[PDB]
Design a protein around this motif. Structure first.
Motif, PDB file in Angstrom:
ATOM      1  N   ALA A 118     -35.884   6.833  54.036  1.00  0.00           N
ATOM      2  CA  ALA A 118     -33.878   6.508  54.612  1.00  0.00           C
ATOM      3  C   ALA A 118     -33.325   6.249  55.945  1.00  0.00           C
ATOM      4  O   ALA A 118     -32.810   5.544  56.030  1.00  0.00           O
ATOM      5  CB  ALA A 118     -33.365   7.996  53.846  1.00  0.00           C
ATOM      6  N   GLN A 119     -34.189   7.372  57.003  1.00  0.00           N
ATOM      7  CA  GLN A 119     -33.471   7.365  58.188  1.00  0.00           C
ATOM      8  C   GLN A 119     -34.573   5.885  58.938  1.00  0.00           C
ATOM      9  O   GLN A 119     -34.132   5.226  59.870  1.00  0.00           O
ATOM     10  CB  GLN A 119     -35.506   7.946  59.069  1.00  0.00           C
ATOM     11  N   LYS A 172     -34.853   3.200  57.309  1.00  0.00           N
ATOM     12  CA  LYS A 172     -34.186   2.095  56.872  1.00  0.00           C
ATOM     13  C   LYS A 172     -32.557   1.876  58.075  1.00  0.00           C
ATOM     14  O   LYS A 172     -31.897   1.065  58.258  1.00  0.00           O
ATOM     15  CB  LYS A 172     -34.136   2.150  55.719  1.00  0.00           C
ATOM     16  N   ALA A 173     -32.658   3.314  57.931  1.00  0.00           N
ATOM     17  CA  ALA A 173     -31.261   3.597  58.953  1.00  0.00           C
ATOM     18  C   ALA A 173     -31.260   2.827  60.688  1.00  0.00           C
ATOM     19  O   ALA A 173     -30.474   2.042  61.108  1.00  0.00           O
ATOM     20  CB  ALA A 173     -30.676   5.091  59.031  1.00  0.00           C
ATOM     21  N   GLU A 180     -28.514   0.491  61.965  1.00  0.00           N
ATOM     22  CA  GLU A 180     -27.584   0.717  63.038  1.00  0.00           C
ATOM     23  C   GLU A 180     -28.548  -0.084  63.588  1.00  0.00           C
ATOM     24  O   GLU A 180     -27.542  -0.141  64.767  1.00  0.00           O
ATOM     25  CB  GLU A 180     -28.149   2.571  63.567  1.00  0.00           C
ATOM     26  N   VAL A 231     -30.155   7.935  64.742  1.00  0.00           N
ATOM     27  CA  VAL A 231     -30.423   8.298  63.601  1.00  0.00           C
ATOM     28  C   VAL A 231     -31.034   9.684  64.314  1.00  0.00           C
ATOM     29  O   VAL A 231     -31.114  10.372  63.166  1.00  0.00           O
ATOM     30  CB  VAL A 231     -31.983   7.276  63.334  1.00  0.00           C
ATOM     31  N   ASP A 284     -24.337   9.359  57.035  1.00  0.00           N
ATOM     32  CA  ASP A 284     -25.545   8.620  58.611  1.00  0.00           C
ATOM     33  C   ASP A 284     -25.224   8.623  59.510  1.00  0.00           C
ATOM     34  O   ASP A 284     -25.304   8.959  60.524  1.00  0.00           O
ATOM     35  CB  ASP A 284     -25.069   7.335  57.867  1.00  0.00           C
ATOM     36  N   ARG A 285     -23.533   8.591  59.942  1.00  0.00           N
ATOM     37  CA  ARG A 285     -22.826   9.207  61.566  1.00  0.00           C
ATOM     38  C   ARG A 285     -22.858  11.134  60.961  1.00  0.00           C
ATOM     39  O   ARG A 285     -22.191  10.969  60.148  1.00  0.00           O
ATOM     40  CB  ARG A 285     -21.781   8.242  60.922  1.00  0.00           C
TER      41      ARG A 285
END
Lengths: 239, 73, 238, 232, 213, 228, 240, 96
Positions: free
Chosen positions: B28-29, B31-32, B36, B61, H1-2
């Motif tokens: 998840a991170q 991909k994040a 971003e 992140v 996310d944010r």
């Protein structure tokens, strides 16, 4: 050895034990001190006794040397050990340098002791504040106060204790130069302050003066009623 | 490398460098960082992806806190 | 959480977050790169400042005639281990009348710093010491960590944005055991030019270089004497 | 190493020492016992049941001498007892080396009680969980004292500790007087142990020591079996 | 019983020059009636501009030398610069006083430059007192060496003697004559003469042989 | 609810040292300027009462005849550091018969700056400016509650510190002189302080290559005020 | 929660999670194996190459306590070499006091008591290390001891710690240590770690072998280069 | 996310908050807000709003229509320093 830090910093930069100790001073009995040019004068209020009991032991005014008088507020127990260490120190000055102790030096001793006392381990800070009045060599009478953080601080007049900011407003709203003209006029200013404070109808005030060359002198409650009598008399004709 | 597929990716990437400077992450991170960096590329208005886009995406992140730290080294 | 307060407490995964936070402070400081040739050891530092009227913070510290270090973290613990470092040089120089072997020194540093990483209410040290020195075996480049797991290497880099410099050292590390100082030092400058923003690089006041030499005492080179080394480099490609 | 250097016992907002209050409950869960003085010496009696037949009752003891003329029993837990027993064993010797005289029992109780109160105020320790009964005929007259985990003491004529002592003190109130004898205190001591004892009271369910002008001693199960004999 | 002290001989000499400094000593280490060696210099280059001479008990000379060489690096790493001559004398006086109740059996003379290119001589007692002088001899035959330099260097007891400053070569032949003249009468005067010269440019050394009784 | 006194941040730095960095912002503002002609220095007093005697408080205190200091934030803790500075200089003169240099004084205090623990208690709430004239001419140094010290040329520390630095970088240059440094400083002080500027709100002190450390008084001070 | 913070607090079912956590940190260290042969002890350490920038011969996980006593570790390197320091100093106490070389039964007893000393207090933590000890005596044969993080030691004909503990010791028992003079022990000890830490998990590894016995004249030293080059010659026959 | 942080403003965000809550009240014109933001190092916009809305009440105390700088000073000691016993912030700075 109980090694534990007590005085720690707040997340916004404060010392919680210090500012709580200032509240412990802030609920203490009200004490007022001024200075004259030739005779200094200071007195506590709110004796709050049983009106049939002895009280020479409850006297919250003592001396460190002949030229050094000292009053305080806060809690009674922590004050007198600071007084004892001050007596040992001011005596040790004369064991050193032959002069009597200057009041600025002894207040630097007390405040300097107090700050490192807040810096030490496993110690709550002191919960007292004190007014220290001394007429030094060459006849320059002055005074200082002591924050529980240990910041010595000179004044021309001051008052600490419960209900002290309004009394300070009375002192700036009443203090002039010609009020320090006569000695009994200055005593009438002090009795005007404690009379302008919280009741204390003679039986709760305890004033003591020094003529910058003598020792301390405490008037019996006859000049309290006499000076309060001429104070209410002057207020009566002034009304 | 998988989630960096459907984007305009210039040959500025070093997935070995990025994965080596980024430990302790999950899919998840990881991909994040890609998404971003994809937004920061639009923040500067560029069309393709460069290395520093991923490098700033690492910082976002990680999601640090700022308090005036320059007095080191 | 609650597993993140004291050094004594083990994680349920078995990774102490106090040491893991001590690894952050070395990443907070500025970057610097050390390396070695066959016969020389060179470390290059990157200074920072706060205001333009303020001076730049130095990082290279002379320890001995054959020992030099670089710091990353807090200057108080840097000087704290530095005074211990000088002390452990000069006392053994006083006893055995000989220079001190670098690996034997760094072993004493790890045994020194391991002790507060186990007790109660005792922080670790935040420092990133890159150590250049001479044994009888010539150059030695050692790096430290707050976890006191010292690493031998031939070239490393620590500080903020050091990984790109590590990539440059990987893709040019084969040359390093052949070339001398005059292009070796600017190979290190080609490492430090990578870790920068895209407009300012090397303005002769933000950089310092230390060299110990096979017949040369460890000499710190600051601002002026950097400029003979700083010239003769390629412009930044774009 | 080093300790903690803070006392783990504070005052409640109700003004109570909660650990001492719990320690009194731990004493109250202990084995029952009683002690009676009557005009020649003090009789102490306890209630000692082995948990099974596999034990040796001749191994451990509840009745413990302190000197030629002082014995001591408890009503509480095991391992805390022996430590302060050994402490008192020392303290009689530090008296005797100074004065060359056997210790007054009250002067012993002062020092033991001071140990217990110092220990419940000292930093980083749980307090003791026993209560004691102390006997001895110094200067002719016998004496009978009872301590507590808090560190106080009393001068009881006769009392009981352990379980059901609130019933045992009523039975001693309806039982004892001033004028008795040692064997009479034995017989009513076996009676008040039988007020809350188990079904069988053999020679080893109990342990009884006595003081005299001849001094303190401890019984054997022969005459203890002869005391349980012709009783109840 | 166990004596802690013994005497090792040796004789040092320093002369403050106008823009220079000369430190000289023999190279004999010996005690009792026998000779340990014929090679033992007492010249010690501390900095480029400071040379110390140490005579007396030899082990204390070695220990004291190494302690000084430690504290120079302590000063430098503490203060980013080298010591000066008066700073060295000011430190070493405290070092000698630091064992007041168990003293070193050591005589000491420090020669070197000032901050202005002038010679400076600092002679030490075994306790820690000193003063700045122009010329001092220490060791065994210092009683032989002092009045000759009082006559030639100090120009004392001479009527109508003009005062030329000391030139370097006249100082050199002065030293080379006077150690031979001391060597003819002292038994502790060695067999080779180590001569160290502090200039404004560096340290020069020179060894001259002596007789070898 | 309560962590230890020596706990690192999740961001990595600390807690209590950073809290001490927060703590010095409440102190009165102070400005020192390094100049090749000589280092000047200035501070306000934060006067509260007319009954208060003004000259009893101060922020300038000297260490030697060529080393003066300035403090901010907490004041009662600073006298310890002033004492150790004075004693340290007297040790250095006592053992080396010279003057300890300003930077070496600064690291000598900065080693003391971070030494608290749980053996043998807290960091310090001060922020110090050191005015000094060594053999390298004028000097100026600024240290930290964390002990990080650095040479500055025109440093402003206090409540209005960032505004004075912002208005200070625009006016400082390398070829300043002492009179325009003093007047240029007091213009910024007149901008940032609360009360009306007079000869009692502030005080100054300078150090020179020629003469020793000197503090101004209420006679040579108001000429700059009328000539502001 | 709250029952798993100190080294002085039991669990409600009566154990310590701190020691179990420090034991859990052992299986992130790579692999430390070692068996004794008929007439000596051979240690085996595989060593992960993190980056190319490290120099060969760095940060060795294989120690040398006495002239004969050898140590191979698996855990935190700083605590491991700390234990090597106090153990080495302990053998110096033995020879300094009594005048001969320490046996393994006494040495592992003293070290194990020192490890157990840090299992009782809130002031200190347990170690995050586990390690193996073995040496040869001409009067006592060859020994092989292993010490957990808790402080329990045993004798072994062979032992294995690291990541693939069971996946290492499964193949050790195929050997016959009761008769093989460690000559072929070098090759087989090499092979049983050659068959583990695949190229999926590791980029590249490094062989690190230790070796002691009366063939080594009792003294402890590392293997020579040619013999481990015969082991790496013996490496790529495992692909069949 | 944010994961947006909200911290206290540095100086200029605080001055901007004074310009928000203080643009719409009858005041003395020649006051400065930057002094007040210097007096409030650690403070929220709610606290600043209580300062503005309190000092307006200080203008309504006697009989004034436009507040003054000393009315602001009478707001600052009360809201910051007299109400400083509770203050609600510091254990929520560490979020515990």
């Amino acid at each position: 050895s109980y090694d534990r830090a007590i005085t720690v910093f707040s997340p916004d930069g404060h010392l919680f034990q210090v500012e709580y100790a200032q509240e412990a001073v802030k609920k203490g009995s009200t004490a007022v001190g001024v200075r004259g040019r030739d005779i200094v004068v200071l007195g506590v209020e709110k004796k709050s006794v049983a009106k049939l009991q002895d009280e020479r032991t409850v006297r919250k005014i003592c001396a460190l040397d002949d030229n050094v008088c000292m009053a305080f507020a806060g809690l009674t127990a922590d004050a007198r050990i600071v007084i004892n260490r001050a007596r040992v120190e001011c005596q040790s000055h004369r064991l050193t340098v032959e002069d009597p102790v200057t009041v600025e030096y002894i207040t630097r001793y007390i405040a300097s002791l107090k700050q490192r006392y807040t810096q030490s381990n496993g110690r709550r800070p002191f919960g007292i504040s004190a007014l220290i009045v001394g007429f030094d060599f060459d006849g320059t009478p002055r005074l200082y106060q002591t924050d529980p953080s240990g910041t010595y601080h000179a004044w021309k007049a001051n008052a600490i204790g419960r209900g002290a900011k309004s009394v300070r407003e009375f002192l700036e709203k009443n203090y002039t130069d010609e009020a320090i003209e006569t000695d009994d006029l200055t005593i009438k200013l002090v009795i005007k302050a404690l009379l302008e404070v919280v009741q204390s109808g003679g039986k709760n005030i305890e004033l003591a003066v020094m003529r910058r060359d003598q020792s301390l002198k405490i008037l019996n409650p006859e000049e309290i009623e006499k000076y309060v009598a001429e104070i209410e008399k002057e207020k009566e004709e002034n009304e | 490398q998988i989630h960096s597929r459907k984007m305009n990716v210039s040959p500025d990437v070093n997935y070995e460098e990025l994965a080596r400077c980024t430990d302790d992450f999950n899919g998840a991170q990881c991909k994040a960082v890609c998404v971003e960096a994809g937004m920061i590329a639009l923040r500067r208005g560029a069309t393709e992806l460069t290395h520093e886009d991923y490098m700033e995406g690492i910082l976002e992140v990680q999601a640090k806190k700022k308090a005036n730290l320059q007095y080191y080294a | 959480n609650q597993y993140d307060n004291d050094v004594t407490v083990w994680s349920p995964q078995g990774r102490i977050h106090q040491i893991e936070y001590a690894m952050e402070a070395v990443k907070q400081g500025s970057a610097t790169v050390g390396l070695k040739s066959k016969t020389h050891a060179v470390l290059v530092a990157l200074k920072r400042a706060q205001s333009e009227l303020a001076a730049h913070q130095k990082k290279i510290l002379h320890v001995d005639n054959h020992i030099g270090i670089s710091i990353a973290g807090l200057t108080a613990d840097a000087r704290l281990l530095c005074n211990f470092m000088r002390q452990e040089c000069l006392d053994s120089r006083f006893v055995f009348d000989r220079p001190l072997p670098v690996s034997r020194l760094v072993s004493l540093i790890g045994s020194k710093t391991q002790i507060p990483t186990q007790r109660y209410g005792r922080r670790p040290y935040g420092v990133g010491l890159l150590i250049a020195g001479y044994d009888d075996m010539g150059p030695h480049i050692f790096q430290t960590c707050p976890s006191a797991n010292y690493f031998d290497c031939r070239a490393m880099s620590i500080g903020a944005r050091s990984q790109s410099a590590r990539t440059y050292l990987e893709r040019h590390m084969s040359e390093f055991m052949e070339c001398n100082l005059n292009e070796l030092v600017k190979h290190g400058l080609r490492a430090l030019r990578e870790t920068l923003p895209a407009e300012q690089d090397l303005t002769t006041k933000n950089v310092s270089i230390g060299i110990v030499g096979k017949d040369l005492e460890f000499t710190i080179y600051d601002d002026d004497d950097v400029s003979p080394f700083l010239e003769g480099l390629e412009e930044r490609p774009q | 190493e080093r300790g903690y250097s803070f006392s783990l016992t504070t005052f409640s907002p109700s003004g109570k020492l909660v650990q001492i209050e719990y320690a009194l409950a731990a004493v109250a869960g202990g084995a029952p016992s009683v002690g009676i003085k009557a005009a020649n010496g003090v009789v102490l009696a306890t209630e000692k049941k082995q948990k099974s037949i596999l034990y040796d009752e001749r191994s451990v003891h509840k009745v413990e001498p302190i000197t030629k003329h002082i014995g001591l029993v408890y009503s509480g837990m095991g391992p805390d007892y022996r430590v302060l027993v050994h402490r008192a064993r020392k303290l009689a010797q530090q008296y005797y080396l100074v004065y060359q005289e056997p210790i007054p029992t009250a002067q012993l109780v002062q020092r033991v009680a001071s140990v217990m109160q110092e220990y419940t105020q000292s930093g980083g320790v749980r307090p003791f969980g026993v209560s004691l009964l102390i006997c001895g005929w110094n200067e002719g007259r016998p004496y009978l004292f009872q301590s507590d985990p808090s560190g106080a003491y009393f001068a009881w004529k006769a009392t009981a500790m352990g379980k059901n002592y609130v019933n045992g003190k009523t039975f001693l109130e309806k039982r004892y007087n001033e004028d008795l004898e040692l064997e009479d205190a034995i017989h009513t001591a076996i009676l008040t142990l039988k007020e809350s004892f188990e079904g069988q009271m053999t020679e080893d369910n109990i342990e009884v020591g006595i003081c005299n002008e001849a001094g303190f001693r401890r019984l054997t199960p022969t005459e203890v079996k002869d005391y349980l004999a012709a009783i109840a | 019983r166990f004596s802690p002290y013994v005497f090792n001989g040796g004789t040092i000499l320093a002369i403050a020059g106008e823009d220079f400094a000369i430190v000289a000593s023999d190279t004999r280490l010996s005690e009792g009636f026998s000779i340990h060696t014929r090679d033992s210099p007492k010249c010690y280059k501390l900095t480029d501009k400071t040379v110390i001479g140490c005579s007396g008990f030899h082990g204390d000379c070695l220990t004291l030398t190494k302690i000084i060489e430690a504290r120079l690096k302590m000063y430098k790493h503490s203060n980013n610069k080298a010591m000066t001559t008066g700073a060295i004398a000011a430190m070493l006086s405290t070092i000698l006083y630091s064992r007041r109740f168990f003293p070193y059996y050591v005589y000491n003379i420090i020669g070197g430059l000032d901050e202005e290119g002038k010679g400076a001589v600092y002679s030490f007692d075994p306790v820690g007192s000193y003063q700045r002088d122009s010329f001092k001899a220490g060791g065994s035959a210092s009683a032989m060496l002092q009045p000759l330099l009082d006559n030639q260097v100090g120009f004392k007891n001479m009527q109508n003697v003009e005062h030329v400053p000391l030139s370097l070569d006249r100082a050199m032949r002065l030293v080379k004559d006077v150690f031979i003249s001391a060597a003819e009468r002292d038994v502790y005067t060695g067999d080779a003469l180590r001569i160290c010269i502090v200039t404004k440019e560096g340290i020069r050394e020179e060894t001259v042989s002596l007789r070898k009784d | 609810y309560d962590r230890g006194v020596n706990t690192f941040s999740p961001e990595g730095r600390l807690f209590q040292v950073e809290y001490a960095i927060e703590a010095i912002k409440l102190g009165s503002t102070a400005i020192g300027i390094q100049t090749s002609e000589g280092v000047c220095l200035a501070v306000e007093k934060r006067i509260t009462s007319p009954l208060m005697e003004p000259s009893s408080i101060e922020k300038i205190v000297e260490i030697d005849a060529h080393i003066g200091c300035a403090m901010s934030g907490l004041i009662a803790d600073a006298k310890t550091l002033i004492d150790k500075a004075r004693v340290e200089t007297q040790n250095h003169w006592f053992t080396y018969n010279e003057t300890m240099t300003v930077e070496s004084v600064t690291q000598a205090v900065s080693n003391l700056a971070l030494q608290f623990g749980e053996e043998d208690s807290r960091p310090f709430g001060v922020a110090l400016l050191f005015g000094g004239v060594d053999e390298k001419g004028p000097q100026l140094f600024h240290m930290d509650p964390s002990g990080t010290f650095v040479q500055c040329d025109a440093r402003a520390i206090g409540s209005a510190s960032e505004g004075a630095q912002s208005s200070l970088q625009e006016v400082y240059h390398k070829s300043m002189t002492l009179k325009e440094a003093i007047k240029s400083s007091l213009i910024i002080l007149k901008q940032v302080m609360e009360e009306k500027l007079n000869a009692t709100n502030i005080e100054l002190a300078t150090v020179q290559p020629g003469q020793n450390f000197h503090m101004f008084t209420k006679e040579e001070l108001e000429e700059v005020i009328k000539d502001i | 929660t709250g029952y798993d913070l100190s080294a002085s607090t039991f669990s409600p079912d009566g154990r310590v999670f701190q020691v179990e956590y420090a034991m859990k940190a052992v299986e992130n260290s790579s692999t430390a194996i070692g068996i004794r042969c008929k007439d000596g002890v051979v240690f085996g350490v595989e060593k992960l190459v993190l980056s190319k920038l490290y120099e060969e011969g760095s940060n060795k996980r294989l120690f040398n306590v006495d002239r004969h006593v050898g140590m191979a570790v698996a855990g935190l390197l700083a605590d491991a070499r700390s234990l090597a320091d106090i153990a080495r100093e302990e053998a110096s106490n033995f020879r300094s006091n009594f005048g001969y070389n320490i046996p393994l039964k006494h040495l592992a007893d003293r070290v194990a008591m020192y490890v157990h000393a840090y299992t009782l207090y809130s002031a200190v933590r347990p170690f995050g290390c586990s390690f193996m000890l073995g040496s040869y005596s001409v009067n006592d044969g060859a020994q092989l001891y292993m010490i957990d993080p808790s402080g329990v030691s045993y004798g072994y004909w062979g032992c294995a710690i690291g990541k693939a503990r069971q996946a290492a010791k499964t193949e050790i028992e195929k050997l016959q240590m009761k008769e093989m003079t460690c000559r072929d022990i070098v090759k087989e000890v090499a092979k049983i770690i050659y068959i583990v830490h695949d190229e999926v998990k590791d980029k590249a590894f490094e062989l690190e072998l230790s070796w002691v016995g009366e063939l080594t004249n009792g003294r402890h030293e590392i293997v020579p280069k040619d013999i481990r080059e015969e082991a790496e010659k013996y490496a790529k026959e495992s692909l069949k | 996310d944010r994961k947006i942080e909200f911290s206290l403003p540095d100086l200029e965000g605080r001055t901007h908050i004074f310009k928000i809550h203080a643009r719409s009240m009858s005041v003395e014109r020649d006051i400065r807000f930057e002094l007040l933001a210097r007096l409030c190092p650690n403070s929220t916009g709610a606290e600043i709003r209580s300062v503005c809305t309190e000092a307006g009440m200080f203008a309504i105390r006697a009989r004034r229509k436009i507040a003054t700088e000393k009315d602001f000073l009478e707001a600052v000691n009360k809201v910051i320093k007299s109400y400083a016993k509770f203050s609600a912030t510091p254990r929520y700075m560490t979020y515990n």
